[PDB]
């Protein structure tokens, strides 16, 4: 009835992925793909591949109608953080979180 | 033998956090602020079980006052009248009659006037 794709531990900060994923939530897949194509953000290409993967799953595995699909669910979960250090003045090092994202897109008929 | 701090701590703190259900933001999530909020809620509830009794008597008295002034008595005269008459009906019952059975309240207000 619905088809899901996940991109696990993508090396992009969740906040940066979410501000884009919020555009495509509830949209028809055709419009969703257009919105991502014309949203100039680092997250857009990554979310496009998850969405097109979900559509391929819907067509190949569950034999759903691709022209009829809507983005039922889309959300970004925190992945494991890479911990780094930037040297600051006076010998002090400051933490840098190289955060990762799990990007989930679910597509459904209507 | 060694006793590690296993489970008893989590069980105790989780009960306190559940008692803080419905409280704003951190107050329903975090043990330290939930524990303060629950202590304070219990203190207010203790205080308010006493205040509740005062509050309802003020409500009843205000309603008896309103219904008595419709019979050309103040609350202070009516209650004196009922005392002299020997009528022992309490303010909660009078306030109930004054809203629900005004005819009955007027009968008592007459008994009061007679005693005065």
């Amino acid at each position: 009835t619905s088809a899901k794709a996940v991109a696990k531990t993508v090396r992009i900060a969740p906040r940066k992925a979410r501000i884009v994923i919020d555009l495509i939530r509830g949209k028809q897949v055709g419009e969703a793909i257009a919105i991502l194509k014309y949203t100039p953000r680092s997250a857009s290409p990554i979310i496009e591949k998850v969405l097109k993967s979900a559509i391929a799953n819907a067509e190949h595995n569950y034999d759903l109608d691709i022209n009829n699909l809507v983005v039922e669910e889309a959300f970004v979960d925190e992945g494991p953080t890479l911990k780094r250090f930037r040297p600051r003045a006076q010998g002090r090092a400051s933490a840098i979180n190289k955060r990762t994202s799990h990007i989930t897109v679910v597509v459904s008929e209507v | 033998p060694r006793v590690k701090g296993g489970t008893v701590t989590r069980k105790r703190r989780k009960k306190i956090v559940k008692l803080a259900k419905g409280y704003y933001g951190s107050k329903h999530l975090l043990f330290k602020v939930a524990n303060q909020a629950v202590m304070k809620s219990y203190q207010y509830a203790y205080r308010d079980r006493r205040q509740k009794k005062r509050d309802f008597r003020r409500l009843w008295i205000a309603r008896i006052n309103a219904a008595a002034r419709m019979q050309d008595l103040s609350y202070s005269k009516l209650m004196h009248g009922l005392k002299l008459a020997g009528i022992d009906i309490n303010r909660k019952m009078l306030a109930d009659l004054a809203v629900n059975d005004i005819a009955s309240f007027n009968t008592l207000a007459d008994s009061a006037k007679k005693a005065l």
């Binding site: 884009v20 257009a34 919105i35 014309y38 949203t39 | 951190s26």
Partner: protein, 53 residues
């Protein structure tokens, strides 16, 4: 200089009410049959929707 109190979740979320993207200004082309930015050249057809190149 420094935050006097940590910012609550509610207050943080209220501040971010306006931190969002707008949808791109796009529309379906006739010759292509796919979406394009207005006042831009459509790559699907490979030229400007109106003016042929």
């Amino acid at each position: 200089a420094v935050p006097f109190r940590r910012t609550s979740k509610a207050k943080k979320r209220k501040r971010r009410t306006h931190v969002k993207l707008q949808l791109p200004g796009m529309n379906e082309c006739s010759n292509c049959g796919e979406y394009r930015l207005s006042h831009h050249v459509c790559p699907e057809c490979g030229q400007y929707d109106g003016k042929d190149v």
